[PDB]
Design an enzyme around this catalytic site. Structure first.
Site, PDB file in Angstrom:
ATOM      1  N   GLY A  10       0.990  -1.117  -0.187  1.00 18.54           N
ATOM      2  CA  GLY A  10       0.000  -0.070   0.144  1.00 18.54           C
ATOM      3  C   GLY A  10       0.790   1.365  -0.081  1.00 18.54           C
ATOM      4  O   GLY A  10       1.976   1.327  -0.502  1.00 18.54           O
ATOM      5  N   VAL A  11       0.209   2.476   0.471  1.00 20.44           N
ATOM      6  CA  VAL A  11       1.012   3.729   0.401  1.00 20.44           C
ATOM      7  C   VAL A  11       1.010   4.160   1.972  1.00 20.44           C
ATOM      8  O   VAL A  11      -0.097   4.033   2.564  1.00 20.44           O
ATOM      9  CB  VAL A  11       0.385   4.532  -0.365  1.00 20.44           C
ATOM     10  N   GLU A  61       1.264   5.022  14.979  1.00 20.21           N
ATOM     11  CA  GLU A  61       2.166   6.193  15.571  1.00 20.21           C
ATOM     12  C   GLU A  61       3.183   6.756  14.286  1.00 20.21           C
ATOM     13  O   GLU A  61       3.712   5.888  13.814  1.00 20.21           O
ATOM     14  CB  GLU A  61       2.677   5.770  16.715  1.00 20.21           C
ATOM     15  N   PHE A  62       3.692   7.997  14.609  1.00 18.80           N
ATOM     16  CA  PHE A  62       4.632   8.579  13.620  1.00 18.80           C
ATOM     17  C   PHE A  62       6.051   8.410  14.206  1.00 18.80           C
ATOM     18  O   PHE A  62       6.281   9.056  15.314  1.00 18.80           O
ATOM     19  CB  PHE A  62       4.135   9.764  13.196  1.00 18.80           C
ATOM     20  N   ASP A 107       8.962  -9.186   5.643  1.00 19.24           N
ATOM     21  CA  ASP A 107       9.532  -8.290   4.736  1.00 19.24           C
ATOM     22  C   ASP A 107      10.355  -7.236   5.460  1.00 19.24           C
ATOM     23  O   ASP A 107      10.433  -6.145   5.211  1.00 19.24           O
ATOM     24  CB  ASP A 107       8.483  -7.825   4.087  1.00 19.24           C
ATOM     25  N   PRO A 110      15.665  -2.203   5.873  1.00 19.08           N
ATOM     26  CA  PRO A 110      15.793  -1.026   6.445  1.00 19.08           C
ATOM     27  C   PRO A 110      15.052   0.301   6.660  1.00 19.08           C
ATOM     28  O   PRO A 110      14.589   0.824   7.595  1.00 19.08           O
ATOM     29  CB  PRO A 110      17.278  -0.494   5.817  1.00 19.08           C
ATOM     30  N   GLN A 111      14.128   0.143   5.220  1.00 19.80           N
ATOM     31  CA  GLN A 111      13.226   1.104   5.101  1.00 19.80           C
ATOM     32  C   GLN A 111      11.804   1.000   5.963  1.00 19.80           C
ATOM     33  O   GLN A 111      10.995   1.679   6.151  1.00 19.80           O
ATOM     34  CB  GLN A 111      12.423   0.832   3.511  1.00 19.80           C
ATOM     35  N   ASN A 112      11.934  -0.361   6.558  1.00 22.97           N
ATOM     36  CA  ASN A 112      10.926  -0.872   7.485  1.00 22.97           C
ATOM     37  C   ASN A 112      11.093  -0.725   9.064  1.00 22.97           C
ATOM     38  O   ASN A 112      10.441  -1.164   9.764  1.00 22.97           O
ATOM     39  CB  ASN A 112      10.456  -2.131   7.285  1.00 22.97           C
ATOM     40  N   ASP A 125       5.659  -2.146   9.333  1.00 23.54           N
ATOM     41  CA  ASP A 125       5.259  -2.946   8.139  1.00 23.54           C
ATOM     42  C   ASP A 125       5.258  -4.370   7.936  1.00 23.54           C
ATOM     43  O   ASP A 125       6.115  -5.049   7.178  1.00 23.54           O
ATOM     44  CB  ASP A 125       5.841  -2.358   6.864  1.00 23.54           C
TER      45      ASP A 125
HETATM   46  O1  LIG Z   1       4.075   0.307   6.619  1.00 17.85           O
HETATM   47  C1  LIG Z   1       3.712   0.385   7.682  1.00 17.85           C
HETATM   48  O2  LIG Z   1       3.125  -0.534   8.541  1.00 17.85           O
HETATM   49  C2  LIG Z   1       3.910   1.726   8.417  1.00 17.85           C
HETATM   50  C3  LIG Z   1       3.869   1.658   9.868  1.00 17.85           C
HETATM   51  S1  LIG Z   1       4.443   3.298   9.981  1.00 17.85           S
HETATM   52  C4  LIG Z   1       5.436   3.467   8.724  1.00 17.85           C
HETATM   53  C5  LIG Z   1       6.454   4.357   8.392  1.00 17.85           C
HETATM   54  C6  LIG Z   1       7.049   4.195   7.071  1.00 17.85           C
HETATM   55  C7  LIG Z   1       7.917   5.067   6.807  1.00 17.85           C
HETATM   56  C8  LIG Z   1       8.314   6.204   7.661  1.00 17.85           C
HETATM   57  C9  LIG Z   1       9.172   7.138   7.446  1.00 17.85           C
HETATM   58  C10 LIG Z   1       9.559   8.078   8.246  1.00 17.85           C
HETATM   59  C11 LIG Z   1       8.767   8.094   9.241  1.00 17.85           C
HETATM   60  C12 LIG Z   1       7.882   7.383   9.693  1.00 17.85           C
HETATM   61  O3  LIG Z   1       6.882   7.289  10.796  1.00 17.85           O
HETATM   62  C13 LIG Z   1       7.501   6.293   8.638  1.00 17.85           C
HETATM   63  N1  LIG Z   1       6.669   5.348   9.163  1.00 17.85           N
HETATM   64  N2  LIG Z   1       4.949   2.404   7.885  1.00 17.85           N
END
Ligand SMILES: O=C(O)[C@H]1CSC(c2ccc3cccc(O)c3n2)=N1
Ligand SMILES: O=C(O)[C@H]1CSC(c2ccc3cccc(O)c3n2)=N1
Length: 258
Positions: A10-11, A61-62, A107, A110-112, A125
């Site tokens: 997704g996005v 949460e961010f 999955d 590093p991006q996750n 993710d």
């Molecule tokens: O794919 C996911 O389940 C979601 C969980 S929160 C997240 C995500 C993915 C990338 C992010 C980049 C900078 C700051 C963030 O909080 C970021 N958060 N992806």
């Protein structure tokens, strides 16, 4: 209800909840998996705050940024070993918790992996090729928690060396990059490998690298742990829980990153 601020992965978007003023990560895209996922609280797992079905929206949460960005930023000088060790330790705690609840990530990359300003790192993710376990590449449909340990091992090596360990450009290239480094697996090191769905006897037979070369200048404790995370046989691969007791973590601390 939510105002999108910017796309972040997704996005996934950074968004503001107008009902609370909260800044959140909003992912726009079976209910049991999400339930189990939502009920989890751990310091090293990104919190799933809300689930909105209307398309499915997951409100998380961010966090500040992801480990990929941090590693790219740190590429010139590298991440200090104490911080590497802290992050690895934390990720293993998160995995140990997930795995004990019968939850796989599947999955990891590093991006996750998300970090904050205080030295925490969190898994996000839950389910490229670069971090995929060999049993998945060979067509195993019924894989285990061990796939997550392989992925984390690849990430560990990348943090240390500032290069991806196995940057395949295709599934076969991914496998052959693994085989060229660790040796082409056989029935001795990996009983049952030759009956795996996509195993071919025609795979080239490469010798294992002396390993000294794979993650220099990591100390022997680190190399020992990594080698246990990258055992071919998933049944021999170290568990997160055991990895936590590895001597590499005897001096672990929780530094604050730059
Ligand atoms: O794919 C996911 O389940 C979601 C969980 S929160 C997240 C995500 C993915 C990338 C992010 C980049 C900078 C700051 C963030 O909080 C970021 N958060 N992806
Ligand atoms: O899965 C493992 O723990 C490792 C143990 S050493 C090993 C391995 C796997 C394949 C090999 C192929 C040729 C020569 C070797 O020394 C090889 N070694 N796999």
């Amino acid at each position: 209800n939510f105002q999108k601020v910017e796309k972040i992965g997704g996005v996934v978007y950074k968004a503001r909840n107008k009902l609370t003023g909260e800044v959140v990560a909003l992912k726009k895209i079976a209910i049991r998996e999400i339930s189990l996922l939502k009920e989890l609280n751990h310091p090293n797992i990104v919190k799933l705050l809300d689930v909105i079905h209307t398309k499915l929206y997951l409100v998380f949460e961010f966090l500040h940024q992801d480990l990929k960005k941090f590693m790219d930023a740190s590429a010139l000088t590298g991440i200090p070993l104490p911080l590497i060790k802290s992050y690895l330790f934390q990720l293993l705690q998160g995995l140990a918790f997930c795995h004990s609840h019968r939850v796989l990530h599947r999955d990891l990359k590093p991006q996750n992996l998300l970090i904050n300003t205080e030295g925490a790192i969190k898994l996000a993710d839950f389910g490229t090729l670069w971090y995929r376990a060999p049993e998945i590449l060979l067509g195993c449909k019924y894989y285990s928690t061990a796939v997550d340990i392989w992925s984390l091992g690849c990430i560990f090596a990348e943090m240390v060396t500032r290069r991806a360990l196995f940057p395949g450009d295709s599934e076969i290239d991914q496998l052959f990059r693994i085989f060229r480094t660790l040796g082409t697996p056989d029935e001795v090191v990996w009983p049952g490998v030759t009956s795996m769905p996509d195993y071919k006897p025609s795979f080239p037979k490469w010798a294992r690298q002396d390993f000294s070369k794979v993650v220099p200048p990591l100390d022997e404790d680190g190399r020992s742990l990594l080698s246990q995370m990258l055992h071919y046989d998933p049944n021999k691969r170290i568990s997160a829980k055991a990895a936590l007791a590895h001597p590499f973590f005897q001096d672990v601390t929780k530094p604050v990153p730059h």
